[PDB]
């Protein structure tokens, strides 16, 4: 009748005796046990509801979009953000960027190449990178970095940035250190008590000067643009929105700010970046501790690809085993496991409980991507969980990992089609190896909190012969 059950909070603690110390998602899976799929929990001040398989969450964000499809917050960043830009935005300020986004990360003018094209010419700059590397052991972190956010970049800025750019690594570093932060049991404790913990020093201050220093760089850009400006042929997203700017601009209320402008775009780059840089750096671990996966795709990569025709889209219809491997890297690896936030918009009917306007909402993608009745024994790797017995290609409702409804993922053309392009175009032309053996290969998460991110690791790059 009224809000869904839970365990019974304290007034300023909420649920936090309660709760496990290993993390947020792990509080809320010992919740789930004993309260089912739809619960309630208080983090600190606030409850928030929590919905778990794929049938509560699709429910949720399909059946119901008109009320689950608000935006709530990440304490860690909205300081920073402060409800700017497409992913932290609601009501009308949501709707003009999102379809502004929408629009511009996908039409890009006459002449200007496609999104698979500026992939494949990436993936080129990455193979030549790699031979350049000789064997050598690395992190592989900054160039899975460096690979996704020039894809970001050349949409938006219309450039990319050498492998070897200082200034460019500076950022990335910013970005990743940023991503573990907000993830930290820290970043995860400030989720129930930023009210008191912001007083103090801590990782939240780290997190919003990264994101100022971050931020720097795009408002300098967005000026040398509006500098070289040209009405008849904007160049990239940044043109495309100044004029936008300058078409609105006797509207006080326009939407198309320069805050939007400058935090529109930060988001952009650091969900393009980090989401599917992450994606990838499991990915390989994933290949160093089962290599018969990766010697298995290669196999179907010379089946159908063969050692020097570059990958392209149109080869995933006759890859199916290597697209099973990629569902499965994204379904073990989680990079979202608790989603982000949403908060209802209007008073709504749950499951016979009643959930008032602004209550924060969480979907727990991780619980439909480790659902057992789609996928048997769901916490291992095992790409034949999305394969048949023909092995053709398994497709499934429980894999989720970009969400659903009015939020989804607005990425997700672009980052299936890197990880696609970028893990075929590497395992085309090298194999893999490490120190580690296989057996003793470490998958246990460096941080989990809103993002579950691996640990770091060696790897060598051994080009085919
Ligand atoms: C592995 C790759 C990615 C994953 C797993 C991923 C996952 C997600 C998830 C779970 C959400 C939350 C949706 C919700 O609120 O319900 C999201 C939102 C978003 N993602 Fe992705 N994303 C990925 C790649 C990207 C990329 C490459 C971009 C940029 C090109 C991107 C841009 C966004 C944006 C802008 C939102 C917010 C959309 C909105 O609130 O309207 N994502 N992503
Ligand atoms: O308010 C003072 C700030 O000014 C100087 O900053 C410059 C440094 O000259 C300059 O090296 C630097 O260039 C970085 C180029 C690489 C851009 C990478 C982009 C890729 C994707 C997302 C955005 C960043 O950007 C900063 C902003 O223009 C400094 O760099 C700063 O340390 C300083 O704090
Ligand atoms: C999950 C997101 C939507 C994407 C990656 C990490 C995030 C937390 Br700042 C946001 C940007």
Redesign the pocket.
Known sequence: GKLPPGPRPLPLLGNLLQMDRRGLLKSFLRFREKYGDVFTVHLGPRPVVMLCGVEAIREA?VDKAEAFSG?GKIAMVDPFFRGYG????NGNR?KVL?RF?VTT?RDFGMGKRSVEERIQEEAQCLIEELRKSKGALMDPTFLFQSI?AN??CSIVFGKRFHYQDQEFLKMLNLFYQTFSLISSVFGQLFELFSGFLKHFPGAHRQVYKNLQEINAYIGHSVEKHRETLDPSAPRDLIDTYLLHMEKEKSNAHSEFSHQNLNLNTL??FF???E??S??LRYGFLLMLKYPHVAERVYREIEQVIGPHRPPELHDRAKMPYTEAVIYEI?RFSD??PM????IVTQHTSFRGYIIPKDTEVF?I?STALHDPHYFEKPDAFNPDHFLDANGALKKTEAFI????????????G??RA??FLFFTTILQNFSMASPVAPEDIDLTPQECGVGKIPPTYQIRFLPRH
């Open positions: 964000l935006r497409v992913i932290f935005a949501w999102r986004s990360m996704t894809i970001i988001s952009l969900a393009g970046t989401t599917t992450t994606t994204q990079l979202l989603g982000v936030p949403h979907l993608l990992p970009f969400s659903l409804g009015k939020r989804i993922c607005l990425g997700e672009i980052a890197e990880l």
